[PDB]
Design a binder for this molecule. Structure first.
Ligand SMILES: CC(=O)N[C@@H]1[C@@H](O)[C@H](O)[C@@H](CO)O[C@@H]1O
Ligand SMILES: CC(=O)N[C@@H]1[C@@H](O)[C@H](O)[C@@H](CO)O[C@@H]1O
Ligand SMILES: CC(=O)N[C@@H]1[C@@H](O)[C@H](O)[C@@H](CO)O[C@@H]1O
Lengths: 165, 165
C-alpha cells in the first residue's frame, strides 16, 4: 500500500508531494510536518553540513542554513547543494548522479551526459570485455553488453564488474 | 514489484535514477533512453512549449529548447520551468505545488510555505469550519481539523471541501 520513503523502497512522490513519516504522499502538516521524509517538507529537511553531508531529496536546494527548499534563499547565495544558481564544478564526482561534462560542470541532459561525459549518469559509457576491461565510474555495474548503468539489466545476470548481484 | 512511472503509481526514483519504459529504476540506455519516464533521461524528457506545457519530473529544469536537465544550459538563460536561476513571481499560482510566499515569490521551505503562504504546499493554511468556511487553493482538500492538504488524511474521511472522495 505504501507509496514512498523508507516504507516504499525509497521512492519519491511526484510534483513535490511530501512523503509522510508513514510512507504516503500528500500535502499539509500530516505529510510535510514532523517525520516528513521527502518532497516539500516544512520545515525543509536538514541537509549539507547540518546533516552529515546528506543531499536534499527531489533535487531541492540546500540553503546556507542547511534546510531544503527552493527560491533565492535556498538556491542562491550560500547554497550548498541541489540546483544551486552557481555553476557546479566537477572532475569530485557530481552529487546525486549528475553528469560531469567534458568541460567539468555538473548537469543532466545531452550536453552533460552525452558525448564527453566523464562520470555520473552518462548516456553511453562503455566497459568490460567490450572496452578493454575498462571500469565504470560511480560504482555502476558493467552490463553484459559492456554498457555502464544500474538496475537489473546491468547489475543482474551477465554483470561483469561493479556491485553485481 | 514496479518502482516508478505509470506502472509504479507515478512514483519517482531517488537520486535522479531513470525510470525505464517498464517502470523500474536505473541508469544506462535501458533506463534513461527510449521511453524513459523520469529521472536523468538522455536525452532529457520534452517539456514546456515543446510538451503541451508539461513540467519536468524530479524538478529538473526545462531548457529554452524544451528538454529537461540541469546546468546553465537548462536552468539559466531561457529556462521555462523547474528551478530556473531567475526568481519566479506569483500572486497566479506557482507551478509544481511550489508555495507562493507572502511576498509573491515561488519556493519551498518556511520562508515560502510558512507564515503568509498564499498558495501551493503551504505548511499550515486554515480552512473549513475552523476558518469560517475559508476555501483551500490549488484544489486541495480541507481536512477534518481544518488544514489544507492532499492525500488520504485530507481528501478522505472528514474532508470538508475541495475534491473529497
Ligand atoms: C556542458 C558544459 O559543461 N557546459 C558548461 C556550462 O554549463 C557552464 O555554465 C559554462 C561556464 O562558462 O561552461 C560550459 O559551457
Ligand atoms: C526497462 C526496465 O523496466 N528495466 C527494469 C530494471 O530497472 C529492473 O531493475 C530489472 C528487474 O525487473 O529489469 C527491468 O527491465
Ligand atoms: C520569501 C520570498 O518571497 N523572498 C523573495 C526572494 O525569494 C526573491 O529572490 C526576492 C526578489 O527580489 O524577493 C523576495 O525576497
Amino acid at each position: 500500500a505504501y507509496e514512498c520513503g523508507k516504507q516504499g523502497g525509497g521512492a519519491l512522490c511526484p510534483n513535490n508531494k511530501c512523503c509522510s513519516r508513514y510512507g504516503y504522499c500528500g500535502f499539509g502538516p500530516a505529510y510535510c510536518g514532523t517525520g516528513c521524509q521527502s518532497g516539500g517538507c516544512c520545515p525543509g529537511k536538514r541537509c549539507g553540513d547540518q546533516a552529515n553531508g546528506e543531499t536534499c531529496p527531489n533535487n531541492l536546494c540546500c540553503s546556507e542554513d542547511g534546510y531544503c527548499g527552493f527560491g533565492s534563499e535556498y538556491c542562491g547565495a550560500g547554497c550548498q547543494g541541489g540546483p544551486c544558481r552557481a555553476d557546479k564544478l566537477c572532475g569530485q564526482l557530481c552529487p546525486d548522479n549528475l553528469c560531469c561534462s567534458q568541460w567539468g560542470f555538473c548537469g543532466l541532459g545531452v550536453e552533460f551526459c552525452g558525448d564527453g561525459c566523464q562520470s555520473g549518469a552518462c548516456c553511453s559509457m562503455r566497459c568490460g570485455r567490450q572496452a578493454d576491461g575498462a571500469k565504470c565510474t560511480n560504482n555502476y555495474c558493467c552490463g553484459a553488453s559492456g554498457y555502464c548503468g544500474l538496475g537489473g539489466d546491468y547489475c543482474g545476470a551477465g554483470c561483469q564488474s561493479g556491485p553485481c548481484t
